Amino acid sequence: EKELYEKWMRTVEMLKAEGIIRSKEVERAFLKYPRYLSVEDKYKKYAHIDEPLPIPAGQTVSAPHMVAIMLEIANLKPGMNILEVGTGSGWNAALISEIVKTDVYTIERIPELVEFAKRNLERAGVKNVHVILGDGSKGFPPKAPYDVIIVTAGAPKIPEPLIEQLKIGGKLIIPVGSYHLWQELLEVRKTKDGIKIKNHGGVAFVPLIGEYGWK
Ligand SMILES: C[S@@+](CC[C@H](N)C(=O)[O-])CC1O[C@@H](n2cnc3c(N)ncnc32)[C@H](O)[C@@H]1O
Numbered sequence: 001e002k003e004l005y006e007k008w009m010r011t012v013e014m015l016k017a018e019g020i021i022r023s024k025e026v027e028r029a030f031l032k033y034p035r036y037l038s039v040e041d042k043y044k045k046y047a048h049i050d051e052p053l054p055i056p057a058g059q060t061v062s063a064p065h066m067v068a069i070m071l072e073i074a075n076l077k078p079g080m081n082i083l084e085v086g087t088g089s090g091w092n093a094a095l096i097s098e099i100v101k102t103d104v105y106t107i108e109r110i111p112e113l114v115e116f117a118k119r120n121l122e123r124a125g126v127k128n129v130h131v132i133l134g135d136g137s138k139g140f141p142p143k144a145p146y147d148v149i150i151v152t153a154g155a156p157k158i159p160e161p162l163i164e165q166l167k168i169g170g171k172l173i174i175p176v177g178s179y180h181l182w183q184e185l186l187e188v189r190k191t192k193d194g195i196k197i198k199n200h201g202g203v204a205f206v207p208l209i210g211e212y213g214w215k
Contacts, residue, residue, distance in 0.1 A: 007048035008034040029098040038091035061089040085136035086152035090117030097128040107136035137210035139165040153208035154183040166190040
């Protein structure tokens, strides 16, 4: 693990030099929870490479720069109430929890991954992350409204439930476009002056499958 962490520190330094990681909060989160903690043993040797990696059930853990970009856009602060849609390995949720210092809610539709993520989080000593099995395109009403909702799967359009569950002034970060390609990373802010949207570039996440996602 010592060798793996050395490589990871270089990755974080690189992201900072690239201007990808720009806040100390995101840098600290990345250093506390290296990506190798979230992937199967056979992929740990590649955890420091800035590329997405496979996880069970045909899904993947995002590339380090993509996770960093989304966290920086989120502008997370202690005490915020965050909902992540698409737990996967639980890596992103762990990072979020380190920054907000409170309960984080994350939803995953595949039972196998709910278990996978729970094991990774427990193994890493994370307690504030709460993994729920369900259709995240419907959000998670029990703990709404949220300061930020971070969706890590691509949707064909912006799910209305996610907008409804945002606090006034809150934001939704979500990929919108085609099934598994040609998606645009959107930053959607819910304000009194209306819904404001900023496009952040092309991406290619796994599809958001659900009632308000893909069929
Ligand atoms: C490829 S992963 C992204 C990364 C993940 N955030 C991590 O830290 O590993 C995201 C996923 O969202 C799931 N996802 C898709 N549709 C979903 C839905 N309707 N509700 C919840 N999760 C969904 C997939 O099964 C998959 O694991």
